[PDB]
């Protein structure tokens, strides 16, 4: 089922990342440039999970390198968290996208629950490998990947969650995806940014 047979029996992140380059666990590997595995080391206490690599990440081979990543770095710095000490990854490892005539970018398309479930074996391997004390779930797709398809990020802000089917029973904190804070009225973006910093500080205080 899904990516399971493509996941080797190793906690070495470099070996896992190389194996993910060969994954065919769903259809998304076909049009994407490459798999984008997580970045960071196994000593990380905090794991952060986004939805999927976007246009820039698909070509950089690294997560959170575009505008959403720059806002996330501003929030991490405000929360006094060193990005270099985190393990940062995504629920889905291949960019799902389309282009619009006249567009300046490839446009993300939402992964189906089917694709998230197919890719989840990689997240389980990452979590088993890193043994984080806390997992920050950035956005609906990531949070639902671990907390259920009905989970609503908007309803659980600031909350330390724990579920029974997650490796090592880490604390889970679900928050807004940084891409949500890039657009909207200034006051709304500023309030939302403060809330993201708050949630990052809850996770770091675990
Ligand atoms: O790595 C990335 C970049 C943008 N958005 C995500 O969810 N993940
Ligand atoms: S998105 Fe995940 S499950 Fe699908 S092919 Fe890529 S690595 Fe495999």
Residue numbers in the entry: 2 to 207
Report text from the authors:
Structurally, UdgX is highly similar to family-4 UDGs (F4-UDGs). However, UdgX is unique in possessing a flexible R-loop (105KRRIH109). Our earlier studies allowed us to propose a reaction mechanism of UdgX, which involves the formation of a covalent bond between H109 of UdgX with the C1′ position of the target deoxyribose sugar concurrently with the uracil excision from this site in DNA.
Substitutions of His109 in MsmUdgX with Ser, Gly, Ala, Gln, Cys and Lys showed the loss of its covalent complex formation with DNA but gained canonical UDG activities. In the reactions of the mutant proteins with ssU9, the entire substrate was converted to product by the H109G mutant, while hardly any substrate was utilized by the H109K mutant. However, H109 substitutions by Gln or Lys, showed poor activity. However, to better understand the mechanism of uracil excision by the H109 mutants, we determined their structures along with a pentameric DNA, TTUTT by X-ray crystallography. The structures also revealed invariant interactions of N91 and H178 with uracil. When we arranged the mutants in the order of increasing cavity sizes (left), we noted that the canonical UDG activity of the mutants increased with their increasing cavity sizes to begin with and then with a further increase in the cavity size, the UDG activity declined (right). It suggested that the initial increase in UDG activity (H109K to H109Q to H109G) occurred because of the efficiency with which the water molecule could be localized to make a nucleophilic attack on the C1′ position.
